[PDB]
Amino acid sequence: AQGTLIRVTPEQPTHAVCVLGTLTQLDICSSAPEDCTSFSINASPGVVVDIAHSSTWPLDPGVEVTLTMKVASGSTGDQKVQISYYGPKTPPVKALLYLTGVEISLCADITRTGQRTWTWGPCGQGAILLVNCDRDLDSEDLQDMSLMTLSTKTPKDFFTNHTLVLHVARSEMDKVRVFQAKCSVVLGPKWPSHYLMVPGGKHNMDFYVEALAFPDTDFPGLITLTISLLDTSNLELPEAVVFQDSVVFRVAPWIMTPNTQPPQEVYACSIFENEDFLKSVTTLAMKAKCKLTICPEEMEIGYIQAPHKTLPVVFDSGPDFGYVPQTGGISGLDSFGNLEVSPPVTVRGKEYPLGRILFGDSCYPSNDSRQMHQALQDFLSAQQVQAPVKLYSDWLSVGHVDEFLSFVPAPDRKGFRLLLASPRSCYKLFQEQQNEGHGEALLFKQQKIKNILSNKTLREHNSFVERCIDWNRELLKRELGLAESDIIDIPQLFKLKEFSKAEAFFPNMVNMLVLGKHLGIPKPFGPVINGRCCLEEKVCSLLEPLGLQCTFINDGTNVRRKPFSFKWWNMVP
Amino acid sequence: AQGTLIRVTPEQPTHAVCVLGTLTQLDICSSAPEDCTSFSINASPGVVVDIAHSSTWPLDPGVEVTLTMKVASGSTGDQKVQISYYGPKTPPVKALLYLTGVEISLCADITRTGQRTWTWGPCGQGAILLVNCDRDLDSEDLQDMSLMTLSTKTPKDFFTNHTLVLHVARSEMDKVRVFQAKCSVVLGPKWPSHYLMVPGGKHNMDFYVEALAFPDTDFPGLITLTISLLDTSNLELPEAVVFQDSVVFRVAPWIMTPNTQPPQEVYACSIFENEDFLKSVTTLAMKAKCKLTICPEEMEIGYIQAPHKTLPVVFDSDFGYVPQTGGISGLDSFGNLEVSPPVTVRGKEYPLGRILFGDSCYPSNDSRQMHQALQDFLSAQQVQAPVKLYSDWLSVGHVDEFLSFVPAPDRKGFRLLLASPRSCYKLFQEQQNEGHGEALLFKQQKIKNILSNKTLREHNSFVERCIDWNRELLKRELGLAESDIIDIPQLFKLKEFSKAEAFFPNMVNMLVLGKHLGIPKPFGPVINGRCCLEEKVCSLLEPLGLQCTFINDGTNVRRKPFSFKWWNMVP
Ligand SMILES: [Ca+2]
Ligand SMILES: [Ca+2]
Ligand SMILES: [Ca+2]
Ligand SMILES: [Ca+2]
Ligand SMILES: [Ca+2]
């Protein structure tokens, strides 16, 4: 989409190359005869002589004469444009421009079906470049590299005194590698440029391209590759550019999946107690008709997608899988237990269709505060698909948001319910039992119901924790566009610790495995009332009516899930 | 403007703090008697109870009740909400909430005329920070600082068991220092937080914030400062957050100025005699009514503007100031940097200009490029988006050797001058055909001998190809037309590595002090008494209003900011 200028002189004939599709400006005035106010152009039927305001159209100060051609040329110097400068002095003098048509096309998957700028939206243009972070040769490799096409319809002797170059910038060299289809090293991290060898006539050359980096602060995510026609007709002067065509790719980002998407594969380890646990997980996986891949003998699995492949990726701190400082900046808040993703959301008009990442930190910097490493936050922010949200999770001894918040599948409203821990519903549930007579039922050491409702230290300890969780509630009701009819509160008692940090009293029921629309909740080991645990009766009476089904286990599991449907390139960040 | 949630229990009365202007949610269902189906709220004339589906509003699963007050409190627990639950077979029970009003305002110059998000445009909201790069004491210092205000209207006993804290992130700490008005050192590069001391009643505290960094790749340009109202009523439990307000600043960028802006003050360097040079400069310098400050016995001067001050800047490799160890290339000098006048490209408007720097056409082993750090620095400043050109074919690598922009009274109000080897040959040929073809040039040579050298006529054809490439690049990326490109005669020659060099002194590298132009001497052919190149350039430039002189050729010219407020442009 970038050509050059053609100046015609009556003194000598001129030779020029016009690439088909490019509107080439013809200078018909700077080199005109001394006196004249007229000019005309009789061209061959293959030359489109466009003019902007024969008919002798006068030599306007600026008269934009542009020229394109229709049929590519195999004859070198065939289409002849002859000008007629007739002013007032003798029959007109005439100038000759012996042109030629060539067709250098660099096509790709810009239409995103599978301007030279990358645009987002249901209507835009752009190519997608996946990263090679997996171990798979031949076709299997051909199916995850991109496919650029270079067609060259040129005269037979055109490439005797012309040459083509395909080059990247010296900033993007290390983030992209290209192979010329056998597949061969063309450009790459050490070589910034390459010259090509193209025979005359029609010769199509297909390229394959891989990225070697994920988007970050140093790398926005856009790569550009350029083809240029360097005219080389004299061996004593440097080469000259006559045409340039570029293309822009965007590297696909790291996308994380929440607990509403249907499961695909589950995993586990061998602490030699699973028999009791794995026996219920194994039943659950086939309750939802899933696959349970046991593993015989801190990890988050997302998906990176292009129009041609949906390769998954693993992140931590095989064939269809993937991978993305250890010394310094190490704390307990750097774990992926401090990372969650909300379901698709709509906040004050804007639509977040892939979710909104959630990580926890402190409320205000101090000397004893803990934070997640800035490198990880910058990495997650560079992935503009899921804009992260900062919460408060430093009042806890561990430092993880998964202690108090979860999301469930649901068949109503936004199609999900936010489960939040609640110290205030446990006290209510205990008091409804004390005011009915059975107030000496034992809990869990072991303690009665009354001895927990008559402890004035635990009550303050839990009032503080409730004041802490309500802040996150308010944060989640404004940055997730939520409403009260979508929050369910699950009873949970807390106690404080070294450095007055919080720790759950009985094992959390908010950190639970959603291997489907019916799931696994850790045992409360709570009071028994009428042959049944009271906490269990309340959580099953709040969750089941939506349509879920709940089990209870005593208590590692990762549930690889289904990539989202919304194509990330159709979103407008 | 965050706030929190208040939960009411019939068992015990509840106390809460409601900051003014924040819509606070009230939980009237989670903790209600198990037999109720109806509820009502009687409150003092100050509590604005807002109910969205005593009228008996039933206990809907999501009946929402939000509260605000239309006043301020100086007494703890002075507004009492009494929620009247009505039992079906039981006399009504009633929860008590003892509210209080406190006002905590953190205001700044967000209206940009003097949401917690920084928005661009004529209708946006944001505050602007200027960088501390001047040697300016207190009186002038408070002139370029920011002015953030914090007003607190609280009961006298409120700040006994409550504490206020102002904090910055552990990333933006190194790029902002905070002073509290006597100015004192509080939150800055080494200290990330500060607990304040506020007396009860009315007490306004002003702050002054300065930045220490320019926008770059590592720093987008936005700095947030947060005020948090905590609660320390119990001495054993950890402190708890009750309210949060925030403000977002943007650091003003580095802006350059083109050759179409009026001059303010020229400069010079008496390295040599240059008596003639100085005379001519001062002459057209007072002719354009611009003061000529001389030096007593490569540097680009921009402007960092804010809604409170337009302090300039100086960039190199009072006033203002802004690296790579070494091994850099000559393409890193500032003769490679130019700025176009405001343009309108395909509907889009660039009202501060569009920067221009040259580099190679395609990377190679012998190619030379401008350092990546400088390009990233310029790209960080989104006001003037740079444009890459081709200048590697020269033996110096500077775009100033063929392009220039002049003032003009027509069309876009300017003309782009480009060097042209093809007009020098034309004028020489007209002067040979007319008869005076043995006039001597500048190793002296005649007109005929230059027109009959076949090594030069190829050296010049290559340069013409390169300059036409640059012309197409400048017509598409600057929205230009062929009625705005005046071509200036110039001949070139090739040297070691086949790089290019001007033959006669470059007349396209000119000093523009308004309608007066110091064009370097061409030392060229004389015809009928005057020089031919001079006659041509005075016949092409003068008609549109300019006036020319010919010195025998360092002068920098500080100028006028376009005054077009950038915060009104939307990049
Ligand atoms: Ca490989
Ligand atoms: Ca998680
Ligand atoms: Ca200072
Ligand atoms: Ca100052
Ligand atoms: Ca310059």
Numbering used by the authors:
A (entry chain B): 2 to 54, 65 to 125, 136 to 157, 172 to 216, 224 to 339, 351 to 370, 386 to 392, 396 to 515, ...
B (entry chain A): 2 to 54, 65 to 125, 136 to 157, 172 to 216, 224 to 339, 351 to 370, 388 to 392, 396 to 515, ...
What does the report in the manuscript say about this coordinate set?
Citrullination, the loss of a positive charge on the arginine side chain to form citrulline, is catalyzed by peptidylarginine deiminase 4 (PAD4) of the PAD enzyme family. PAD4 is implicated in rheumatoid arthritis (RA), where citrullinated epitopes serve as important diagnostic and pathological factors. The active form of PAD4 is a homodimer, and dimerization greatly affects enzyme activity because monomeric mutants are less active. In this study, we identified GAGs as physiological allosteric coactivators of PAD4.
Enzyme activity also depends on calcium ion concentration. A PAD4 monomer has five binding sites for Ca2+, and its saturation results in conformational changes, leading to maturation of the active site (14–16). The calcium-binding sites remained unresolved, even in our 10 mM CaCl2 structure of PAD4.
